[PDB]
Design an enzyme around this catalytic site. Structure first.
Site, short mmCIF file in Angstrom:
data_model
loop_
_atom_site.label_atom_id
_atom_site.label_comp_id
_atom_site.label_asym_id
_atom_site.label_seq_id
_atom_site.Cartn_x
_atom_site.Cartn_y
_atom_site.Cartn_z
N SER A 137 0.84 -1.19 0.00
CA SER A 137 0.00 0.00 0.00
C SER A 137 0.88 1.24 0.00
O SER A 137 1.68 1.46 0.90
CB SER A 137 -0.91 0.00 1.23
OG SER A 137 -2.08 0.76 0.99
N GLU A 138 0.70 2.05 -1.04
CA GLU A 138 1.43 3.29 -1.26
C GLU A 138 1.61 4.17 -0.02
O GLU A 138 2.65 4.80 0.14
CB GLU A 138 0.70 4.07 -2.36
CG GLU A 138 -0.45 3.24 -2.96
CD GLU A 138 -1.18 3.95 -4.07
OE1 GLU A 138 -0.94 5.17 -4.27
OE2 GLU A 138 -1.99 3.29 -4.76
N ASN A 139 0.61 4.22 0.85
CA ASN A 139 0.69 5.04 2.05
C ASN A 139 1.59 4.45 3.13
O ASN A 139 1.56 4.88 4.29
CB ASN A 139 -0.72 5.31 2.61
CG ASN A 139 -1.51 4.04 2.89
OD1 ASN A 139 -1.63 3.16 2.02
ND2 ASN A 139 -2.06 3.93 4.09
#
Lengths: 472, 473
Positions: free
Chosen positions: A295-297
């Protein structure tokens, strides 16, 4: 580290027109107390570098309601009416910046690096310039972004990005020992960590202040040397943007694509799934197979949506939905997250799209005058050759309009970066040089059917098989 | 992550001439089992990018004894006789690389960044080229380093450095869960962490394999996604290069003076990086009612005194490779982080020794052509940011009253116009990039004239010139 009792007292000296870094992904890990302090302070004409614009009634949105901001440097500004409002109406300057590049630039600002090269954005408005920074009561552009320099290394093209560093940084963190050492919880880290190193004066608000020795020295996320001013937040409302819960007891063209995209999963691979079809495809992953979702975050190993008693505002996916995490998962900062992605460490990147070029050009972030919410991390996710990127989309658009074509109509997300296309009708393998070839045809359609629903010409694999599905 | 039982089985396919990253600072956190495996493997002509050459009989030194290496890319290669013999004989190629840029380059190699700009090395052999990569018998240079491109940003000069990434990486770590997640202990992290991300095939050896859930997710130092091959080390001899212990019951004259004066540069709550020798000894006189945080290039913040007998730990050493202690609220971090911190000017004071200092602040303290070529370590990064106050502590002159302070340095530079203050046993000069020096303290007994004839450049005399200070209290 200087400790404060009052948030206002800590941000009291931010000058008008200052560049302020504001941590947080969506509404996760945002510095709500410090932002509230700026409302009382009334400082204005700020150029706020933040990943997102929070929401209308919370987060950075509050500073927008009060018109205290003149410049936004973010990657994705959706879910904020007052924002896109001010943006479209020409009441706010915005610099849509690819998420990965935004994280690196900020890190560079604190690591003594004035500029660096990245492939994120090449062949895009970011690299060529022309991105709308400020509109003027018209679709017409008052201020257009400027071109980034292009240079090639080892046969690939990269663009030059300069470091970003503000006068102040408002970062949100979990705990701080009395020496000033700071740590972050779950996915609340994101941009808070890197931003805590790229500002003249750093201001951190924590949920709790614990005494020295509470942290294992090897486990301090942000050493005290970076924490100039600390203050314990007085009010935390754990605001959740999107509640996604699941109960422990659980169309057609889309069902087809989802079931076919589910077949792209392999055992032990690392994948990044965009919102929608690609994410839903993960639901059909054989329970005997194990895939790790990034997940990018800042997360590795995302699980299913949380049960009622598992919901946690500090744990959300890239789509701003409350999520869960599987065992052996890990959390990391946004600069890390994109070093990982940009370095091609992720095996598969599946995402949607609006148009795909014959040689792999992708378009999925902007519709001039109708969709200008930002590119998010899409440009970084398709920036490496070591990462297979497959798009999942309906074959043709409203009124049977070509989606696959010679050259895209809408602004690009990246040049020659798509490796495979999966529609409800066909599956194409795409090559930078030889173009696209058909490798799977849906039962019932013919090469001619595909011929007249594809803007360009394509080869037919001698091993063309009927498109596969997998309910099992 | 693929788990192995045999180290050899894990490095079995490294090709001859491959570029291999090898973690470890000094002998701290070095992959001794994987290195031992390469001895059996016999792979040759390797380009080993490692911070140091370990020692003669251990660490990367072993691969040098067996002549399995042709190229060394390191920052500091001292304490290794076999190493220099090969280097001086011209049998080994070496690329002396500033520690900080070595760390950044490696990180760039794993983060999708082909090149970046840094001020470390500007105005130095690194930037202008000519650094000896390979000598020939007679002492001349067979292969000289090449110039780095120069570009200025916001009024300062920077040089372009390209990413480094190998075919393989041999990293040493503390623990690994059965999923492949890795963590590091104390200062054993250093280069191991960044290197674990910049190689086609990563091989990590751990002291122990724990099961999933042992680590708090937000505290995993290297996520499984970077660990390609994992193996538990069979033998760890916790080799300690320099044992420095202290008992719970405890220089000359010109040296005592400088130390006692340099001790006055400390302020409450400041962050400082102290070079080996005088600057480090100065920290001993820091008032107990004052608190200063000591930074260690190998990845530490909050160094303490030397360890007591039962505190010695091979995983905790200072930049000088001595066994060290850590004070409460201390922290550990990777070498790339350590230098982001230093390069970003987050450290308040950088005190180090020197051989020559220019009128406007040029520094020379890493190389004596044909007599001292062990690499610049992190010296070039430590004096690379305008924001960090750098003061040099050195004896005023050399033998026969040969000048140490002068118009232009004789020895190769460590950095241009980067020294802010000079402290000798005779005087204290404030130095400015434009207006040159300014005598601000004179030692009791000497005169401006005495200083005049022991200094190679002009200098102004502050109207507030005071007798040099000292502090035993």
């Amino acid at each position: 580290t200087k400790f404060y009792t009052d948030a206002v007292e800590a941000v009291k000296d931010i000058p008008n027109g200052a560049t302020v870094l504001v941590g947080g992904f969506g509404l996760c890990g945002i510095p709500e107390n410090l932002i509230g302090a700026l409302l009382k302070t009334g400082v204005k004409e700020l150029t706020a570098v933040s990943n997102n614009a929070g929401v209308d009634n919370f987060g950075l949105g509050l500073l927008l309601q009060s018109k205290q901001i003149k410049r936004m440097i973010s990657s994705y500004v959706g879910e904020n009416a007052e924002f896109e409002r001010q943006y479209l109406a020409g009441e706010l300057e915005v610099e849509l910046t690819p998420q990965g590049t935004l994280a690196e630039r900020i890190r560079a600002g604190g690591a003594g690096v004035p500029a660096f090269y990245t492939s994120t954005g090449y062949g895009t408005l970011v690299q060529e310039g022309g991105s709308p920074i400020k509109y003027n009561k018209d679709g017409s552009i008052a201020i257009a972004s400027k071109p980034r320099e292009v240079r090639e290394f080892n046969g690939q093209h990269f663009i030059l990005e300069e470091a970003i560093r503000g006068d102040f940084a408002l970062v949100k963190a979990w705990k701080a020992d009395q020496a000033g050492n700071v740590t972050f919880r779950k996915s609340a880290r994101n941009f808070n960590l890197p931003m805590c190193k790229a500002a003249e004066t750093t201001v951190v608000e924590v949920e709790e202040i614990v005494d020295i020795g509470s942290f294992a020295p090897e486990d301090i996320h942000i050493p005290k040397i970076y924490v100039h001013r600390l203050v314990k937040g007085e009010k935390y409302e754990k605001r959740i943007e999107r509640l996604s819960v699941r109960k422990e007891e659980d169309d057609n063209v889309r069902e087809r694509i989802i079931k076919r995209a589910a077949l792209e999963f392999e055992d032990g691979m690392y994948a990044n799934l965009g919102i929608g079809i690609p994410l839903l495809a993960s639901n059909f992953i054989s329970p005997n197979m194990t895939v790790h979702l990034q997940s990018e975050n800042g997360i590795l190993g995302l699980g299913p949506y949380p049960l009622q008693n598992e919901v946690d505002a500090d744990l959300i996916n890239a789509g701003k939905e409350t999520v869960t995490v599987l065992p052996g998962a890990s959390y990391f900062s946004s600069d890390e997250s994109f070093a990982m992605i940009r370095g091609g460490h992720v095996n598969l990147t599946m995402l949607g799209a609006m148009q795909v070029s014959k040689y792999g050009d992708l378009a999925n972030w902007m519709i001039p005058g109708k969709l200008v919410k930002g590119m998010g991390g899409a440009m970084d996710l398709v920036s490496s050759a070591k990462t297979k990127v497959v798009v999942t989309m309906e074959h043709s658009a409203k009124g049977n309009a070509h989606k696959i074509m010679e050259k895209c109509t809408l602004p690009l997300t990246g040049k020659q970066c798509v490796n495979r296309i999966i529609t409800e009708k066909a599956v194409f393998d795409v090559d930078r040089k030889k173009g696209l070839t058909l490798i799977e045809l849906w039962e019932g359609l013919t090469v001619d059917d595909i011929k007249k629903s594809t803007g360009c010409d394509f080869a037919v694999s001698p091993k063309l098989i009927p498109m596969q599905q997998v309910t099992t």
